[PDB]
């Protein structure tokens, strides 16, 4: 749209991508973490390894 | 706009007119950068004979 293009232009004008995103400094970021499995490809009993997606 | 302390300090340290990652930190000529290293093992996963 027209409003999404202006927002994308405004959004990334000055964005340092290696400063961690907190307003204060002593505040930690909180990362909600979940993992999903698609298939279990193989578990080699000989080499003792496990391949997952 | 609004920035952090870390963003301002990051803008001050790695400045292109002042910091360059291709010349080594020698204050003078023939100065040895003493680095020190220590290996930490995690697992013997395999030994292919």
């Amino acid at each position, epitope marked *: 749209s027209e409003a999404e293009h*202006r*927002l994308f232009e*405004r*959004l990334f*004008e000055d964005y340092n991508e290696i400063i961690r995103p907190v*307003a*204060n400094v002593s505040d930690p970021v909180i990362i909600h973490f979940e993992v999903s499995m698609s298939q279990l490809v193989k578990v080699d009993e000989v080499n003792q390894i496990m391949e997952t997606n | *706009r*609004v*920035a952090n302390a870390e963003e301002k300090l990051m803008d001050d340290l790695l400045n292109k007119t002042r910091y360059n990652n291709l010349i080594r930190p020698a204050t003078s000529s023939s100065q040895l950068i003493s680095i020190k290293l220590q290996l930490s093992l995690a697992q013997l996963i395999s030994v292919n004979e």
Partner: antibody
Amino acid sequence: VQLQQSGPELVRPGVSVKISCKGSGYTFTDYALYWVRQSHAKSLEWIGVINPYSGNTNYNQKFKGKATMTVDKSSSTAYMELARLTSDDSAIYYCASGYDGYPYTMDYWGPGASVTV
Amino acid sequence: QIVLTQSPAIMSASPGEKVTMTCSASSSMTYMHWYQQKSGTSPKRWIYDTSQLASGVPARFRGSGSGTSFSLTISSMEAEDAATYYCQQWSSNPLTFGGGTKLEL
């Protein structure tokens, strides 16, 4: 949507002063509060910004050693305290609440308090 | 870091006349806002992101500009359009406003 402030106050120079700003008609969190002074020549300057949900402040570098900005999540009211009042501080003080997103503007404005020193 | 300057300071126009105001900067920017204050009361948000209009604003006005030069334009002059217009940028620390242009009849 209303912002409510205190009345005009007559304070001698050398005494700290405290004014307030209480907002209603909108959800008080998720916005941010800007403090703007205006002299008698109608040339108006910016003092500071507070976030009333966390309390993170940013002051203007001209006004760092003078103003103190607090909020209160109980009654939804911000307090601004000025110190070292001189003759060059008789002005009109506005609180203005804006959304903390990329417009970054003053969406709503208060009536304005009058400080005469 | 950036100090804005408006031109002209005091101006006037007849109802039905094109009006142009300019706001200039020390260095370059891309986005700049415009506020309207009447006599006695509080300002209002009037133009944001250098071209857009707020909610309760008639669609006659037009803001445009780039680099270090910006402008507001009135096509059809209004009877109740006597106010004071301020231009302001947040793109450089600190938040500096404009000097103010007073438009009267």
